[PDB]
Amino acid sequence: ASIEVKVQQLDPVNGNKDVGTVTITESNYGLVFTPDLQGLSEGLHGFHIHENPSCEPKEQEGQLTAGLGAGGHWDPKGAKQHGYPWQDDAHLGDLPALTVLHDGTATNPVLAPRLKHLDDVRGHSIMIHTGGDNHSDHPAPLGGGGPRMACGVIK
């Protein structure tokens, strides 16, 4: 019982490019996201499930902004605030930060305790940001993830 999500680096100009996958499985403590990515910059990267099952760009202030088609952080319970994966009054789509090693790969799995069944995340997207995630809207909103760097649609 799993969902393999194809993830691509976002490039509204020359076209998105494959960088691997993220496999979602169920554990007795929540959904587990196991990455198998490469070609990314080393460090911690914001990692959240977004509203729409789309990784396409959107016009914003005359510019084609990468990944805006995915909408905001998935928040079906209306928490209206960014937080920790283990915080109840935070976007349900807030996952633990992704770790990209010196060699540009990410294979360390992370758990989202608030997510319980695979079908619950189908029909949405998974987003990887250029920046990190301090799990707060302070001092930077949405954890300070910044630009949408990679994305995949959850089938």
CB of 145 to Cu ion, least distance (A): 5
CB of 121 to Cu ion, least distance (A): 14
Q: Is 138 annotated as a binding-site member?
A: no
CB of 128 to Zn ion, least distance (A): 13
Q: Which of residues 61-80 bind Zn ion (CB under 5 A)?
A: 73
Quick one: what does residue 109 bind among Zn ion, its own copies, Cu ion, none, with the CB cut-off 5 to 8 Å set by partner type?
A: its own copies
Task: Say which amino acid occupies 11.
Answer: D
Where are the strands (E) in 1-155, listed by range? Answer: 2-9, 17-27, 30-37, 43-45, 47-50, 58-60, 63-65, 98-100, 110-112, 124-129, 148-154
Do residues 40 and 106 make contact, with C-beta atoms less than 8 angstroms apart? yes
User: In a 10 Å sphere around its CB, with 0-12 CB exposed, 13-18 middle and 19+ buried, how is residue 35 labelled?
Assistant: buried
CB of 96 to its own copies, least distance (A): 7
As given in the structure block, the two tokens for residue 128 are: 């990887």
Which residues of the chain form contacts with its own copies (CB under 8 A)? 27-30, 32, 42-44, 84-88, 96-97, 99, 101-102, 108-111, 113-114
Rounded-to-integer distance, Cα 54 and Cα 11, Å: 14
Quick one: what does residue 113 bind among Cu ion, its own copies, Zn ion, none, with the CB cut-off 5 to 8 Å set by partner type?
A: its own copies
The answer to whether 51 contacts Zn ion (rule: CB under 5 A) is no
Task: Pick the closest to residue 32 from 92, 115, 129, 133 (CA basis).
Answer: 115
Q: Which is nearer to its own copies, 95 or 126 (CB)?
A: 95
Instruction: Tell me the binding residues for Zn(2+).
Output: 73, 82, 91, 94
Binding residues for Cu cation: 48, 50, 73, 129
Interface contacts to Zn ion, rule CB under 5 A: 73, 82, 91, 94
